[PDB]
Amino acid sequence: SLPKIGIRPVIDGRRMGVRESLEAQTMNMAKATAALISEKLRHACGAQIECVIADTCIAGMAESAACEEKFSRQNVGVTITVTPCWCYGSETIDMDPLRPKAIWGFNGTERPGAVYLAAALAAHSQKGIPAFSIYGHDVQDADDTTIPADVEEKLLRFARAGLAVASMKGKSYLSVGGVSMGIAGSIVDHNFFESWLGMKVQAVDMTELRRRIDQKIYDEVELEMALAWADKNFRYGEDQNAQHYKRDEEQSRAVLKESLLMAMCIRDMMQGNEKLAEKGLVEESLGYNAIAAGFQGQRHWTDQYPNGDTAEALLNSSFDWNGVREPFVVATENDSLNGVAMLMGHQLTGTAQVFADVRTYWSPDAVERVTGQPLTGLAEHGIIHLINSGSAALDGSCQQRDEEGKPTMKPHWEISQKEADACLAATEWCPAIHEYFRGGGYSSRFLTEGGVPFTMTRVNLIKGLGPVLQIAEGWSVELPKAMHDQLDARTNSTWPTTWFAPRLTGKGPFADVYSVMANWGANHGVLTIGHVGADFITLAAMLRIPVCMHNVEEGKIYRPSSWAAHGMDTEGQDYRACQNYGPLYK
Amino acid sequence: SLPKIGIRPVIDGRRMGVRESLEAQTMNMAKATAALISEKLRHACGAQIECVIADTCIAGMAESAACEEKFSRQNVGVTITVTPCWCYGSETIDMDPLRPKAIWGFNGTERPGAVYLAAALAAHSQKGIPAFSIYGHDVQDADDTTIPADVEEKLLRFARAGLAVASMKGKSYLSVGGVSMGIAGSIVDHNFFESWLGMKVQAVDMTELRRRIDQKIYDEVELEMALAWADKNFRYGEDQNAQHYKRDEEQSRAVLKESLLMAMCIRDMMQGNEKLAEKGLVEESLGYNAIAAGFQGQRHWTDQYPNGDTAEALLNSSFDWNGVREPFVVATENDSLNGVAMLMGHQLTGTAQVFADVRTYWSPDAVERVTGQPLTGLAEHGIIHLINSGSAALDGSCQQRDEEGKPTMKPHWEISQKEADACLAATEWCPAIHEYFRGGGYSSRFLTEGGVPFTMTRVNLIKGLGPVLQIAEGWSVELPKAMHDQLDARTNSTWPTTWFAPRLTGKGPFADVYSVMANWGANHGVLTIGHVGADFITLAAMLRIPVCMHNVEEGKIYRPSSWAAHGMDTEGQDYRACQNYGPLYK
Amino acid sequence: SLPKIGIRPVIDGRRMGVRESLEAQTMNMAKATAALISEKLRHACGAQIECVIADTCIAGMAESAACEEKFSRQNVGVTITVTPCWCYGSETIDMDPLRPKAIWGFNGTERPGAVYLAAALAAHSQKGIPAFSIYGHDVQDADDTTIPADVEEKLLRFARAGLAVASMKGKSYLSVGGVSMGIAGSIVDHNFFESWLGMKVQAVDMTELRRRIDQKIYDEVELEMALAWADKNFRYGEDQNAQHYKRDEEQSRAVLKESLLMAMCIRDMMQGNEKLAEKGLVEESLGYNAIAAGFQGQRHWTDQYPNGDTAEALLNSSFDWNGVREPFVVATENDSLNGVAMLMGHQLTGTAQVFADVRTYWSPDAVERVTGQPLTGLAEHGIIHLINSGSAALDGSCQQRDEEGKPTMKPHWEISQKEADACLAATEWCPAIHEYFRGGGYSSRFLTEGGVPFTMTRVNLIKGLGPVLQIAEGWSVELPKAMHDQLDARTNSTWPTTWFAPRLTGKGPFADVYSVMANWGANHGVLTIGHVGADFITLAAMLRIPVCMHNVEEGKIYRPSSWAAHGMDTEGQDYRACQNYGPLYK
Ligand SMILES: [Mn+2]
Ligand SMILES: [Mn+2]
Ligand SMILES: [Mn+2]
């Protein structure tokens, strides 16, 4: 049952003509705002956002409380309060501390909603319930129905981030296994998930994965459909293994089968499968109500059974053998923390999220030193090498194209069947190397097209301080083939690659590309299509996660009004305010 | 809408006949629970309590999730989880912080439900979401359908209290005027109502009340119905005023009219009146969505107009000219902290609450000196005089008799109109003394019957500590008329009276009657009928208000299990645990 | 390298003869202490305790600085300062915050040790580093070298506990699996182990155990030995499974084989096995450096592979197919918190530890109702069924016997091989009930001999409060054969049983037997032989873990001096002391 947005039309309660004068414009402003969001935006799942409107305009507590009754029955997880006139501050505001809120005041003189806004905001900050401000840059006339650029931008950025918050609430992270090679992020912090995101964590031991394959706790016909799809579509790459370690044709397909079964069995665990009920396996059918998940893999799975690379790549992809669909969020090396970043990215943009190891920083001096060539253009100042250990969403090739014909990544509802297969055609599946993946496996190798805007994000936990976010907006570069193959042969050529250059501000961590990587707080990161830092920043305020690091333009910063009271400085305000309000849910 | 109780039947997840073998009993047990609550309990307003059972038994996150969706659209604000078997702990618990919750495990051996209870509870306190334990004293045979008596007490005590938490949530306290005569409780701490109770505060200047009377903003037909009704029933008391400050009948009619108007205009303010819409006054029709109020009175109102003595009495009573109805909660002198006690007591009992000033402690030495005869029986160790400034719930006369035919106060739905008139028959209406109340008034004078159990409660705000709760289970007593008459003349004989004897423990404040007076945290207190200390204590723990003074036996103290982990000592664990979890809402 | 005990003799600084008088006495008293300790105490593993003395006698900063670097060199985890004279306080105290320290002032008149003790403690508590205080009631003459009874208890109790804290520092807890059946204790909290105990947690997925048994990563020679032993010594009980679920003998051989192979494999993982390195399995030969360990089992392993009933039971015993050894600590269901109470139990007593489900409380009324008979003697007031879900240290049969020939448990170095076979011939190996344990297994069933004194303990984590300790001293009982069989039948007759009865104080949780269970913090607990509540209380205090529940007479309560400054109440002092000082390690 999807969350909804609740519009609260708010009004001057005084009569003898004043209320009746204002009613129509007020409710129409409400309607306007439903209209704007519902057409402009979608859930990440794909569905149409349903906005709920109060039965009458609110001018005080009786009317205000009817709305709450109407909203609770209707699962509203966000609200916007809209008005063109002055109304009675604290009597009319929304006091539920759990939901993100925003106040839109019509910037006018004849209709001075802007005035009420600043007062209703001051009530919010005084009662410890922060709210966002929507304030038009230019005074409009009282007979105008248009919505300016700025207002619409905020209205939408707000709603984009509010629907993310409410979508996580009440849902599960599924931890298939636990700690992978002492990686911090795989030490799943149930209190972080419960207190900040409002999630439950379900832990499942990887023998549960094994059990499902063996005891035939999957859809047997789907396996054949999957394999059929696998055969027609999968272009294989070079085996790189030592000769005595190679696998014959029959062994190679048993690996492949298992790999596919793992993908299937994980999905069955995350979201359930009615077919297993029919098949009689009634217990296993319900799933763990999980919108994100991790798979440990190394060391203990991959030292005997096939690595999860295929399964991870297919589940993070927008498409598979059953057609196009909304991508899953499955973290490799069970990196619950990178999964959070993915899950936010997913819910903010509706697109596939590229899991990525932050492998190498290529210094301009260093690249001249081994390729003989110069880093040129976007890579002038240095390059960074994003390359996961055998898995990534296939959407990352960027064979998807926009309307202007440039390479990009897109929502699942915007994706035609031809673009699905085009992305497969960019993908060669190289066997895993047996010293590390003794059970075998297949990598998904691709190269992300150059010149794509990307947002590198990461969430870390810092003892004594809590969770923090890191952001680095940038671009993928496309190096000369001569240079590329030699840095690729240099690293791990079996694996998917992305060349990333980050926007520099010449300040602090973004002074030079070196320090960007040097101030990263983990070996992993998530790549989200686009420049979305401004949207990420707003979500981190809503969760009261401060941002230790970002290159987003100061003008673009959008947070609850309460934050500005915590200081003029954009960074300093964030730590005090986050400390103040603390986690949302407990 | 009214709040509902969610019942969560929880079950072992495994099949092969295991879940099957239990579904029946586990479902039957939720139904038995909802039935009992629904039969033996009512809302404070007299409505039937609905209960919502989960669609399926719960064994994991997915079923648990669907219970939540069901519960959210159904306005449930209390849960009880029931099981007769072991289940999967943290997967199956209710996670919402803002709801009171309980767990009831079947004390069986074939059915080891208490073994899940113990694990679930440990889960709760590890995850900072405390919950109540319901464990039956005696092992029960698997086929037994009956609910033990000790289990019934706990279930009901929990429901009774939980409903009160959920009833206050989102309602208003209407403060009519500001501070009265420097009384701390008249400084309305808006944050306390928000954070602790989940209510809001509406402030109305008393000029508004004047305005309604001036501009005839009230159902005019009602007024002559009121006035008619009083003329038929109101006894009158001697004018203890001076000769020059006495009033001719014409003047007296003016105050009584006004005294009865205030009752109606305050009531109309608190909840609203559709008649006012019908007469064109659509703004005033609505009300402030208020379940409690307070009226300032002195000095600024009582120095010109008639005091609220009469209004307050009738409003807090369980009947008026329109017959027997659920009482209101209006605080004399705008004592919002006496308001809260009144509110809490009323929600726990359904009955009317007696506002009292805590006027005199009469020593046994002191009584013998002024009357020549000693206090005897229940008054053996001292008496405390409880007498409010002119007002009190007429039901406080205790003219009502119960099933065994002895003095009491019943929930309004067990009040026959015949009894209603007996409480009016024992009340004499006496004029206000002019020097204090210049605008005059009438004061409901009655004498409470002896031997009636009472609990006396107060809430107080201690800066740097928060809200605290005082409780004192005791008896009202009858004194010999000669004795009573002397002590009434010294104090105020136009004012209603109750002679209170607190039950002693011989320890702390309850070592003697003097100490009970001397520790009481304010000049005002509240009388709830019967011995309801246990219910208050439970309610207090649900709201995380520590209890600082009580004479309830140690076995009766019922609180979440987490409390026990903060220490064996019932006073020590309470402060520490209350310090830990803090106010419920923010 | 085990920790050592550092003994500090301290002396009056001043020379000119007086110092020189005391030097002989001062260190003769320190050598007595080192002799007393190493005579009456041994390490839990069996080794003799090594007491390092300071090279000189300490009288100022200079000598005390030498003594530390010597003490750092020798691995002392505990210090005991002794003296028979005045010395210079702030100059002579051990200042290392991590080591648990005690000070032993001699009670003489010519030799004023008492005075030094108070000034030293005062300096300690003023400098934030609590220490214990040893003081004899009765005064002794300076020529007397014998050490009195009461000083002996305080020295032994201190060193016994300080060694516990010392032995756990830097060691690891091995988590074989993740969360078991949503049990809080099996959500291993890494930061608890680290901060409070100075331990690490190593997480291994249960698939790694699979690999070791499938790829023969074990000693195959021992395996045959084990099977041989198993055939010779194992008695079997009857199969209580359904017929269609009964295993034939070919299957029962494999199930047994793997159960035993689990034992061996889990051991290897904990401490290393060098036979493996010879065998070319060098990486698996090191192990994880573990002094406790949890095994998850349900649900994921037990739904396809044989359970750990047998393995757990054999590892936690004081003997196996290689004869008598220091028992291991393996927690069933990966309940790490029960593991911690086992670890503590073990370190303090050197015995085996019994892991229990706190399954049923049998009120007198209940036992009369069902058996027709009444409980009697120690069982007079109630009885609590302690029964683990398949596995328990076989020592728990209490077939081992003491000097007088009374039932008991002994540390592994006082257990005759004849005794171990006694313990084993009390057992019968019942096959696992198929529907809970699909994979099979063998549940070690015995009946604990009555009259034995026992201590039940538990550790819980409370959000906002941190860890806490539960203690209940009592005895096991022996009921009439007829009564036992009625009670056992309906419960779980294939599983090991212990009838426990807690000493009642009349107060709080120990007012009666119902309360004991009712306030118990989890489904699980640990049985440690005898009445060692006094020991756990002392170890808790060194560990800064409040004691929320205990029935130890307060005469025996022994904690650091600083505690006394936090109040007279033996409970309030504790919570305040623990919140002040908090975890030893970060
Ligand atoms: Mn990696
Ligand atoms: Mn008063
Ligand atoms: Mn158990």
Residue numbers in the entry:
A (entry chain B), B (entry chain D), C (entry chain A): 5 to 590
What does the paper say about this structure?
Thus, we speculated that the addition of Mn2+ to the RdFucI crystal would increase the binding occupancy of Mn2+. After soaking RdFucI crystals in a solution of 10 mM Mn2+, reliable Fo-Fc electron density (> 6σ) on the metal binding site was observed where the position of Mn2+ was clarified in all subunits. However, the temperature B-factor of the Mn2+ (76.56 Å2) was higher than that of the whole protein (60.69 Å2), implying that Mn2+ ion is still not fully occupied in the metal binding site. Mn2+ was coordinated by OE1 (average distance: 2.62 Å) and OE2 (2.65 Å) atoms of Glu337, OD1 (2.72 Å) and OD2 (2.72 Å) atoms of Asp361, NE2 (2.52 Å) atom of His528, and the water molecule (2.79 Å). The average bond angles of Glu337(OE1)–Mn2+–Asp361(OD2), Glu337(OE1)–Mn2+–His528(NE2), and Asp361(OD1)–Mn2+–His528(NE2) were 127.32°, 86.25°, and 73.96°, respectively. The bond angle between ligands and Mn2+ showed a distorted octahedral coordination. The structural analysis of RdFucI showed that apo RdFucI contains Mn2+ with a low occupancy in the active site, whereas the occupancy of Mn2+ in the active site of RdFucI was increased by the addition of Mn2+. In contrast, the activity of isomerase activity was increased by addition of Mn2+ because the occupancy of Mn2+ was increased in the active site through additional Mn2+, which served as a platform for more substrate binding for isomerase activity. Therefore, the binding affinity of Mn2+ is considered to be low because RdFucI does not stably coordinate the Mn2+ binding sites by the ligands. As a result, the addition of additional Mn2+ may increase the occupancy of this cation in the active site of RdFucI.
The enzymatic approach using l-fucose isomerase, which interconverts l-fucose and l-fuculose, can be an efficient way of producing l-fucose for industrial applications. Here, we performed biochemical and structural analyses of l-fucose isomerase identified from a novel species of Raoultella (RdFucI). The monomer RdFucI consists of 19 α-helices and 23 β-strands comprising N1, N2, and C domains. In the asymmetric unit, RdFucI subunits form the hexameric formation arranged as a dimer of trimers with D3h pseudosymmetry.
